[PDB]
Design a protein around this ligand. Structure first.
Ligand SMILES: CCCCCCCCCCCCCCCCCC(=O)OC[C@H](COP(=O)([O-])OCC(O)COP(=O)([O-])OC[C@@H](COC(=O)CCCCCCCCCCCCCCCCC)OC(=O)CCCCCCCCCCCCCCCCC)OC(=O)CCCCCCCCCCCCCCCCC
Ligand SMILES: CCCCCCCCCCCCCCCCCC(=O)OC[C@H](COP(=O)(O)OCCN)OC(=O)CCCCCCCCCCCCCCCCC
Ligand SMILES: CCCCCCCCCCCCCCCCCC(=O)OC[C@H](COP(=O)(O)OCCN)OC(=O)CCCCCCCCCCCCCCCCC
Ligand SMILES: NC(=O)C1=CN([C@@H]2O[C@H](COP(=O)(O)OP(=O)(O)OC[C@H]3O[C@@H](n4cnc5c(N)ncnc54)[C@H](OP(=O)(O)O)[C@@H]3O)[C@@H](O)[C@H]2O)C=CC1
Ligand code: SF4
Ligand code: SF4
Ligand code: SF4
Ligand code: SF4
Ligand SMILES: [K+]
Ligand SMILES: [Zn+2]
Lengths: 103, 114, 176, 205, 94, 145, 95, 207, 112, 341, 125, 44
């Protein structure tokens, strides 16, 4: 059971997202970012939005910026619950997954 | 006309890489058929290998030959390590595709494609 | 500012050392963990009794699509194709022509529900509130073909669900 | 934390498992907790802040051993800091509009769209052609929950991106799995996969 | 909320916490599912005068990149060295 | 233009006018550019279009009931910058972004006018002119169109 | 309204119906053809014409910002009624 | 401070320009162009022969210290005789700065593998080979990474069709998944969106 | 003396002042073989001498770390080793030489 | 042609082949290959089924969306037959059973049912009709299965004179009851053969050859009103064929002669099973019937099909019958059986 | 070190395209004509490469437009005709080039509208 | 007047976030002493 080499073969969920985006408007491409790290949906949206706002040379209003941080940190809670509890589930501790997935 | 080479400096050097690849594929076919439990014979597998090398016989650019050999080595590695599955090996034989006759009349009857 | 999550030095006074020996031999911190799961055994479970009980939703919920009408019964859709243009999935297909009375109306309006990503862009784009995503989410089918909606299906959805859809739009249209 | 943090079985499965050095983590392209677990003091919310992250107070958890256990402790403390940020966002939420008051980028309100000629034109054009973006290219990154998430976005002046490379933090992390698993057993590889916090929607795209 | 006193005591003791002050099941402290209508504010560009678009057009201020060198004194770094972080005074050690 | 409106009044409304079965007129959309008038006079050699009234009530049309049936009449659909003049046969059938443009040649006569064939989903939707200075300039005949 | 072809297949509000000898009607065998019975062309015709006292009237479809974009309709012709291009409501100027 | 307009940071623009010519002075053998965008991103355009010298200098030099390779990608521009632009995005933690290094290549010209400089570059180069067909010399293990086994072509090239050339299904006769020429029940609908009116005069090209 | 640098795998150095003096002096020696007018030599000698000045005039490690602004003194030692490795590599590359080749006409033009 | 049945596309899954086929008996061995080949090219297939819908699931992936339509039918009910055929251009009859049940006997499935399908098809205007008979059908046969094949074959031709009738030999394939039948005998020790299999000659035909022949009959205007005999390219003694089966499967072969009357008694024993009998008296008879030689009928070559030798495909069928020790043996490890010249 | 390769550039064997979509296709290199419905000329700046149109047919289920042509939507943009031609040759496509059509310069005179003796006098404004 | 989702006038009440694992249990001496006491009673 000693691991002599790990060879991760990926692409089993490769869906040409980056080629598909070239056929979309900037609005139409936004939902593709929900489905990248599909546990941190709104954080992915924010990264794409900041990139487009930078090329546009426009600024979002302060209330939107506060909503983005608020829901970015709610999303960070979503991600870390999934990260920690599924990590614990793999190691054999199945019960934190259930308590925390209610949250 | 002065370009950076990939591996071979000229077609004479390139053809040597091709021959070594052909040997590697030729030797491997008996293993592929046995390991993947294919229902084709070693002769069919080796005929197919010959068919794939023949389609590129007209290349006279050493860089293009070098890239064809690089891909040939990658394809061989996928087969030897059973990264490929039986479906990937059998894709070379297009078993489920019906013949498309190449004569003018046969195309004419079926559609507008030339 | 930063903090250290794991940079602490255990004390070496005989009481602390024995406290740790008792922990190692009597399994005190493992017993403590048993206490937590025991407390959960006596907590009321969070399970709801589906399908007799339903998870809470809001007026903005994006569910099954429906084509709406005006109070007179005329269709709201005037075949502008904005929903078709914006659809990220190219799930919408539209054809249109002058109706027998001259009206600008569709002769085809299909949504491939297996292409759709239930994003709601179509209802944002619609200038007349014709295409909406209703509140229904319980419409799974036994065949793929049953999820290729044409105009008749979508209009029937609107007539079926208009009572709920109109109330949901009433609650949220001031945020739009 | 009562279930895991001081549990000896949990510690045996995570302590000194998948140790990565601060130098290797940087050269292998790690980010997020995969850097901070090894002591590197880096967080884009602090060093390259975006939106209003420069207006909230929080602490960055830092590891010392660079192993799975320290990365587990970092993520747990990061959750506590998230709550601390959320508290400030609730108290300091300001009034005002929620999208840029520029109808060549953000669509008008529906009531304006149905009354004003300019608003109807801009609504029509934004939802069909979309806004054009001045030509250029940007690499923009944020401190995503899984690490640094970035896009290299190329505009050619039209309303559709010319190229969009997505930088997924888990891509570089998973590429380091073989390095991190050296000298470990099969059940440790299971733990090491979880400590990297990999989602293949972003790794594969 | 409906647990008997002895059961509340038992699970309070087992967990070491007072679980009744922070129940994970929601009761009546949550918002009503029907709310009064909103009246949302407008943005800074909602004006009848002194509001010409050409004075508030971010896209038309974007410029092509400045060419610093093309192929057609003290050393510098890309920015000043980063300041060292300070330990948290909220809780420096976990 | 600007991105919003400060007009707080009621708009003008104009009645529509029949000028034949080829060109539909929704004259409330007219912006009084007079391109149609100039084209009819100068290109088609027809002095039937004009302006009546004055001020804000100025109206483009024929005053009396008259059809604009010149062999070149369909070209006023192209040069009208707005939807005031549109094609009756094409009405409501397509949107511009969704059409594919095939650049081709007209065969209805021997002039060889250059055209664009607009198709969508395997169907021909309309015929537009294609600029060729030495042949048809930017016009086509009604039979071509 | 919803008519039936000689084969018995309902004709839709778009005029669709499979002709005899069209195999595609096999898809309805043992099942049904979904047809919406409320024909909008019939429903709108039932609305009464609204009499107004001005040469120009505006229509937003009703319900304020829940209707359609507001348009203004000219009522100078007595040979016909003004019709809203969004919702089909008809208007007339009285005397 | 107009509320809807992105503010300008002139201090960064000056700092990145200064460092831009600092790099050009030190590596004149390779640097072809240096530019700073209006949102303060510095790009270094180099001859491909300088991939290792330039990247090594940026990583190791005491006034650079770009220790992290954030991203390594490619862009396909068919109108150029060297259609592929290779883009390195690097991060400096010491100086809290980013820099972009760009080079070029064509279908038959290899680029030096930068794995010796950044171990992160291993998989990024495999992706570039897989999606664009750019060969990286001296790569420890160059093979496809994202596409299916035996996949033919390089999908991220502009002239590779969106839906490819082959599709898969299960065939009961041969009791396996087979690949066949692609037919779509609904063809993708190409939209022509660009307005025929210029949007940004600042970027107008000379006639 | 530091118990830990805080960075995993970076050992604490017992004699950082002498180690820094060795490394900077080695860096200066290697630069001697670079041409005088090469910008890499002029810039690296300038910044290398500043650090050597600060090490000589500051005996306290903590106060020296504050002056250097390079993080832990072990981080500064590592950077000196990295700079020394780069200087040796620069000698074979010779990047001070003129540009090897101009790009094609529109290689860097964007948008196309 | 009605405009909806004009061929379009390039002959793939999403194309329009113009064929609208009702396939009776599509849920069996032959049907799954016929439905697969029709769906490959974008035909409309009506699959009337008597069985549980679970047992039609393997058919569903075979067509593009909307191209496989399932219907309930009863062989005795003529309305249920009419509903399944009245939109079709060709009707294919593959109904058959190798044993009699309490409810259906050989007469019901090989005479009454095929005649009803042909009669209703003719009344409904169906243009093409393909009916599967049997190479060895004979009114003067000891096998009631083959006797009924002869009666029903005459009835179909009389009811639907323009029908194409196909008479295949025993068909071998993955799901066959031929090579799999012999291979499964190993469970009883030795292999009992009447007269030690020296007095029987068989000419088995590959399943895909029969399928391709059926598909080409639909598209061939010359096939209307004809009778074809689908036979494999080589004839074998029954003993040699069974010996070859056990060689490919690497199972020990112990052939012993069993008299005809003893084999019949054994057949009656297995018939008592209320499920699918392992063997029957009639099955024993057919397996020991020499495969007829019919030079006057057209064959697979006349429909553009080159018959596949049994040697190229036996391993495709018989590999699953080997033990782990022999699973990986290759196609060339066994020598072909002696073929009668 | 550079080697001398004097052959023409032909990447047809390493692009992975099927043979039927190299030799049977006809590329068209052109500058798109101005859409006559609008006066803007910004969509007439660059060269385009497109391929011959092939069959589309109605889907039997929905009536959608089906295609078996993988190049049906493929459009490439080029700065100049020479760039487009070089791209077509190295990929093995036969091509048709069409010259850019530039509007002819015109003599515009507002004063001609009121000519004393010419036919350019307008009868209305 | 403007009405939108806003915090209450004085703000929200304080929100805990810091780790809290209460200190429980007897000392090592007491626990071992009870263990030996049980053993001696068992042996007797
Ligand atoms: C072998 C074991 C089985 C045989 C023993 C059978 C004993 C009879 C059990 C009857 C329980 C029914 C309770 C009841 O009336 O329902 C209330 C319920 C209405 O109450 P409610 O409004 O929902 O509120 C519930 C309480 O407020 C909220 O619930 P709660 O958490 O507050 O509990 C209330 C009550 C419920 O408990 C009981 O009444 C039964 C106690 C049995 C203890 C056996 C252990 O318990 C108490 O009041 C405290 C004393 C109970 C002993 C607790 C000691 C636990 C062990 C110590 C921890 C360490 C363990 C290691 O009515 C029902 O729903 C009827 C449902 C029927 C359930 C099945 C009952 C039969 C069980 C099997 C019978 C034998 C077969
Ligand atoms: C008069 C003179 C008298 C002389 C005689 C005196 C004798 C008494 C004094 C001797 C000490 C008494 C305690 C001995 C019990 C065994 C203690 C033990 O073995 O624990 C150590 C073991 C290892 O712990 P670890 O920290 O991982 O490693 C140590 C460092 N190498 O730790 C573990 O075992 C961890 C076990 C993990 C799995 C636990 C899962 C279940 C936990 C809950 C069980 C609760 C116990 C219930 C028992 C029910 C009994 C029916
Ligand atoms: C004096 C001489 C007297 C000799 C007496 C012995 C005579 C033996 C007669 C041989 C009869 C051949 C039976 C063939 C056979 O057994 O196969 C049928 C059946 C397996 O079923 P199958 O037909 O392959 O397909 C359906 C699978 N779901 O059955 C099986 O194969 C399964 C058997 C399982 C093992 C138990 C036996
Ligand atoms: N070796 C061979 O296989 C040969 C076969 N043939 C003939 O080819 C045809 C099919 O062969 P094969 O497919 O192997 O036979 P199968 O037994 O494999 O399939 C028989 C089909 O007929 C249907 N069927 C049987 N009895 C009835 C009934 N009473 N009512 C309704 N449907 C019924 C079955 O449906 P269900 O699944 O619902 O029972 C099944 O779909 C038969 O006519 C057979 O005689 C000819 C020569 C040789
Ligand atoms: S919800 Fe989104 S994907 Fe679905 S039809 Fe509407 S716009 Fe298209
Ligand atoms: S956006 Fe609304 S009105 Fe326009 S086509 Fe879609 S549903 Fe009809
Ligand atoms: S061309 Fe159109 S907008 Fe101009 S005057 Fe004529 S109708 Fe009005
Ligand atoms: S599309 Fe143009 S002409 Fe038509 S209503 Fe809108 S702005 Fe007016
Ligand atoms: K017009
Ligand atoms: Zn209206």
């Amino acid at each position: 059971e000693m691991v002599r080499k790990c060879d991760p073969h990926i692409g089993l969920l490769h869906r040409g997202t980056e080629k598909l985006i070239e056929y979309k408007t900037y609005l139409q491409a936004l939902p593709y970012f929900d489905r990248l790290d599909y546990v941190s949906m709104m954080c992915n949206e924010q990264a794409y939005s900041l990139a487009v706002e930078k090329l546009l040379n426009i600024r979002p209003p302060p209330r939107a910026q506060w909503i983005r941080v608020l829901f970015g940190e709610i999303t960070r809670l979503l991600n870390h619950i999934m990260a920690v509890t599924t990590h614990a589930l793999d190691i054999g501790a199945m019960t934190p997954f259930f308590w925390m997935f209610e949250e | 006309t002065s370009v950076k080479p990939i591996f071979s400096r000229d077609m004479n050097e390139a053809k040597r890489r091709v021959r070594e690849l052909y040997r590697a594929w030729y030797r491997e076919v008996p293993n592929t058929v046995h390991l993947f439990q294919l229902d084709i014979s070693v002769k069919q597998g080796r005929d197919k290998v010959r068919e794939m090398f023949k389609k590129n016989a007209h290349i006279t650019d050493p860089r293009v030959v070098d890239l064809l050999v690089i891909k040939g080595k990658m394809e061989l590695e996928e087969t030897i390590k059973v990264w490929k599955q039986r479906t990937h090996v059998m894709r070379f034989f297009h078993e489920t595709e019906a013949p498309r006759p190449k004569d003018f009349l046969s195309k004419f009857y079926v559609g507008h494609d030339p | 500012t930063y903090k250290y999550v794991n940079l602490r030095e255990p004390s070496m006074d005989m009481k602390s050392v024995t406290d740790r020996a008792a922990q190692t031999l009597l399994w005190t911190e493992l017993i403590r963990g048993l206490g937590m799961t025991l407390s959960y055994l006596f907590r009321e479970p969070a399970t709801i009794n589906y399908p007799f009980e339903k998870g809470p939703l809001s007026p903005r919920f994006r569910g099954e699509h429906a084509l709406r009408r005006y109070p007179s019964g005329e269709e709201r859709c005037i075949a502008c194709k904005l929903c078709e243009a914006v659809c990220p999935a190219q799930a919408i297909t539209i054809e249109a022509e002058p109706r027998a009375d001259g009206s600008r109306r569709t002769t085809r309006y299909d949504i491939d529900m297996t292409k759709c990503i239930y994003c709601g862009f179509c209802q944002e784009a619609c200038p007349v509130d014709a295409i909406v995503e209703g509140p229904n989410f319980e419409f799974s089918t036994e065949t793929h073909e049953e999820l290729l909606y044409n105009k008749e299906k979508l209009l029937n959805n609107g007539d079926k669900w208009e009572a709920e859809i109109a109330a949901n739009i009433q609650a949220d249209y001031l945020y739009r | 934390e009562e279930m895991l943090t001081n549990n000896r079985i949990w510690r045996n499965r995570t302590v000194d498992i998948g140790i990565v050095t601060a130098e290797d983590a940087l050269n292998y392209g790690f980010s997020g907790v995969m850097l901070r677990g090894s002591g590197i003091q880096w967080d884009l919310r602090k060093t390259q802040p975006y939106d209003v992250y420069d207006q909230v107070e929080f602490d960055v958890p830092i590891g010392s051993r660079g192993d799975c256990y320290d990365r587990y402790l970092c993520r747990v403390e990061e959750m506590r800091q998230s709550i601390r940020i959320i508290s400030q966002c609730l108290n300091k939420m300001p009034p005002g509009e929620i999208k840029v008051d520029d109808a060549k980028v953000s669509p008008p309100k529906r009531a304006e769209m149905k009354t004003s000629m300019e608003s109807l034109i801009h609504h029509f054009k934004l939802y069909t052609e979309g806004y054009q973006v001045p030509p250029g290219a940007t690499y923009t990154a944020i401190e995503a929950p899984k690490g640094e998430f970035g896009v290299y976005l190329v505009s050619d002046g039209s309303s559709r991106p010319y190229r969009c490379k997505i930088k997924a933090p888990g891509f570089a992390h998973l590429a380091g799995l073989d390095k991190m698993s050296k000298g470990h057993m099969l059940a440790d590889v299971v733990a090491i996969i979880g400590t990297q916090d990999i989602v293949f929607g972003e790794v594969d795209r | 909320a409906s647990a008997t006193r002895f059961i509340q005591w038992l699970r309070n003791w087992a967990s070491g916490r007072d679980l009744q002050a922070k129940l994970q099941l929601r009761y009546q402290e949550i918002s009503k599912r029907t709310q009064p209508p909103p009246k949302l504010p407008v943005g800074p560009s909602h004006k009848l005068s002194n509001n010409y678009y050409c004075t508030r057009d971010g896209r038309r201020e974007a410029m092509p990149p400045s060419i610093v060198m093309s192929s057609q004194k003290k050393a510098v770094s890309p920015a000043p060295p980063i300041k060292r972080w300070e330990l948290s005074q909220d809780e420096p050690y976990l | 233009g600007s991105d919003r409106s400060r007009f707080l009044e009621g708009k003008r409304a104009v009645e529509d006018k029949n000028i034949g079965p080829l060109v539909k007129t929704i004259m409330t959309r007219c912006i009084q550019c007079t391109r149609c008038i100039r084209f009819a006079s100068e290109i088609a050699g027809v002095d039937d279009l004009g302006t009546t009234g004055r001020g804000n009530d100025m109206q483009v049309g024929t005053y009396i009931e008259k059809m604009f049936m010149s062999e070149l009449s369909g070209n006023i659909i192209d040069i009208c910058p707005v939807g005031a003049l549109t094609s009756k046969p094409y009405a409501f059938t397509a949107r511009p972004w969704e059409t594919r443009k095939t650049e081709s040649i007209d065969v209805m006569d021997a002039v060889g006018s250059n055209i664009v064939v607009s198709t969508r989903t395997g169907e021909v939707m309309r015929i537009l002119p294609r600029m060729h200075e030495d042949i048809n300039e930017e016009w086509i005949s009604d039979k071509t169109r | 309204g919803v008519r039936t072809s000689p084969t018995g297949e309902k004709v839709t509000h778009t005029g669709q119906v499979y002709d005899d000898g069209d195999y595609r009607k096999v898809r309805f065998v043992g099942r049904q053809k979904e047809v919406n019975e409320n024909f909008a062309i019939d429903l709108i015709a039932e609305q009464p014409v609204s009499q107004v006292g001005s040469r120009v009237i505006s229509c937003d479809g009703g319900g304020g910002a829940l209707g359609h974009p507001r348009v203004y309709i000219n009522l100078d012709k007595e040979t016909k009624t003004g019709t809203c291009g969004y919702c089909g409501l008809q208007f007339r100027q009285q005397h | 401070t107009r509320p809807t307009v992105r503010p300008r940071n002139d201090v960064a623009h000056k700092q990145l320009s200064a460092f831009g010519e600092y790099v050009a002075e030190i590596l004149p053998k390779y640097v072809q162009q240096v530019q700073v965008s209006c949102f303060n991103e510095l790009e270094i355009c180099i001859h491909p022969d300088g991939v290792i010298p330039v990247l090594t200098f940026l990583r190791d030099h005491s006034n650079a210290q770009f220790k992290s390779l954030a991203d390594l990608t490619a862009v396909d521009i068919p109108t150029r005789q060297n259609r592929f632009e290779i883009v390195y995005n690097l991060l400096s933690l010491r100086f809290n700065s980013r820099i972009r290094v760009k080079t070029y290549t064509d279908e038959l010209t290899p680029i030096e593998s930068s794995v010796p400089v950044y171990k992160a570059a291993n998989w990024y180069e495999r992706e570039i080979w897989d999606m664009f067909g750019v060969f990286f010399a001296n790569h420890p293990d160059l093979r496809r990474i994202l596409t299916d086994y035996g996949f033919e072509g390089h999908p991220f090239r502009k002239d590779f069709p969106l839906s490819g050339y082959v599709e898969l299904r299960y065939d009961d006769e041969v009791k396996r998944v087979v690949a066949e020429p692609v037919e779509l029940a609904q063809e993708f609908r190409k939209f022509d969106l660009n307005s025929p009116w210029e949007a940004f005069p600042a970027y107008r090209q000379p006639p | 003396l530091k118990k830990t640098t805080g960075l995993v795998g970076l050992a604490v150095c017992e004699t950082p002042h002498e180690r820094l003096k060795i490394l900077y002096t080695k860096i200066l020696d290697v630069l001697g073989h670079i041409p005088k007018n090469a910008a890499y030599r002029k810039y690296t000698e300038q910044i290398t001498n500043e650090k050597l000045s600060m090490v000589k005039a500051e005996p306290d490690v903590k106060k020296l770390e504050e002056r250097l602004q390079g993080g832990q003194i072990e981080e500064v030692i590592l950077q000196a080793e990295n700079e020394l490795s780069l200087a040796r590599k620069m000698i074979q590359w010779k990047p001070w030489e003129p540009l090897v080749e101009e790009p094609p006409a529109s290689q860097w033009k964007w948008p196309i | 042609l009605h405009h909806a049945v004009i061929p379009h596309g390039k002959g793939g899954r999403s194309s329009v082949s113009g064929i609208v086929a009702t396939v009776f008996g599509a849920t069996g061995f032959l049907g799954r290959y016929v439905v697969n080949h029709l769906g490959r090219m974008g035909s409309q297939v009506i699959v009337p089924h008597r069985c549980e819908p679970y047992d039609t699931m393997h058919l569903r992936p075979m067509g593009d969306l909307g191209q496989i339509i399932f219907m309930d039918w009863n062989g005795r009910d003529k309305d249920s037959i009419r509903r399944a055929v009245e939109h079709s251009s060709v009707v294919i009859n593959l109904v058959g059973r190798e044993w009699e049940t309490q409810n259906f006997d050989f007469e019901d499935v090989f005479v009454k049912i095929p005649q009803a399908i042909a009669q209703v098809s003719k009344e409904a205007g169906v243009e093409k009709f393909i009916h599967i008979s049997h190479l060895n059908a004979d009114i003067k046969s000891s096998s009631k299965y083959l006797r009924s094949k002869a009666v029903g074959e005459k009835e179909v031709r009389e009811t639907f004179p323009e029908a194409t009738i196909i008479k295949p030999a025993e068909i071998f394939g993955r799901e066959d009851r031929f090579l799999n039948y012999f291979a499964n005998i190993r469970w009883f020790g030795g292999v009992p053969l009447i007269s030690l299999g020296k007095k029987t000659v068989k000419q088995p035909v590959y399943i895909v050859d029969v399928t391709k022949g059926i598909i080409n009959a639909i598209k061939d205007p010359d096939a209307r009103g004809k009778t074809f005999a689908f036979v494999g390219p080589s004839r074998y003694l029954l003993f040699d064929l069974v010996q070859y089966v056990f060689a490919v499967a690497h199972r020990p072969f112990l052939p012993y002669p069993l008299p005809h009357f003893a084999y019949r008694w054994i057949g009656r024993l297995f018939e008592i099973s209320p499920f699918e009998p392992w063997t029957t008296r009639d099955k024993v008879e057919r397996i020991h019937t020499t495969d007829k030689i019919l030079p006057h009928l057209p064959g697979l070559e006349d429909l553009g099909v080159e018959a596949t030798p049994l040697e190229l495909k036996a391993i495709e069928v018989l590999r699953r019958h080997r033990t782990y020790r022999w699973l990986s043996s290759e196609i060339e490890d066994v020598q072909p059986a002696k073929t009668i010249p | 070190q550079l080697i001398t390769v004097d052959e023409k550039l032909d990447i047809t064997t390493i692009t992975g395209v099927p043979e039927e979509h190299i030799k049977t296709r006809k590329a068209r290199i052109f500058v798109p004509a101005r859409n006559n419905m609008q006066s803007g000329v910004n969509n007439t700046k660059k060269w385009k490469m497109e391929f011959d149109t092939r069959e589309r047919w109605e889907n039997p289920l929905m009536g959608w437009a089906s295609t078996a042509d993988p190049l049906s939507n493929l459009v490439l943009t080029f700065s100049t005709k020479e760039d487009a031609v070089a791209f077509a040759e190295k990929n093995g496509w036969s091509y048709d080039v069409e010259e850019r059509k530039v509007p002819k310069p015109k003599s515009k005179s507002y004063g001609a509208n009121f000519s004393w003796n010419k036919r350019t006098r307008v009868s209305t404004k | 007047k403007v009405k939108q989702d806003m915090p209450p006038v004085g703000g929200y009440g304080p929100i805990d976030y810091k780790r809290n694992l209460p200190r429980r249990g007897l000392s090592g001496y007491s626990m071992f002493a009870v263990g030996i006491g049980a053993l001696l009673f068992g042996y007797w």
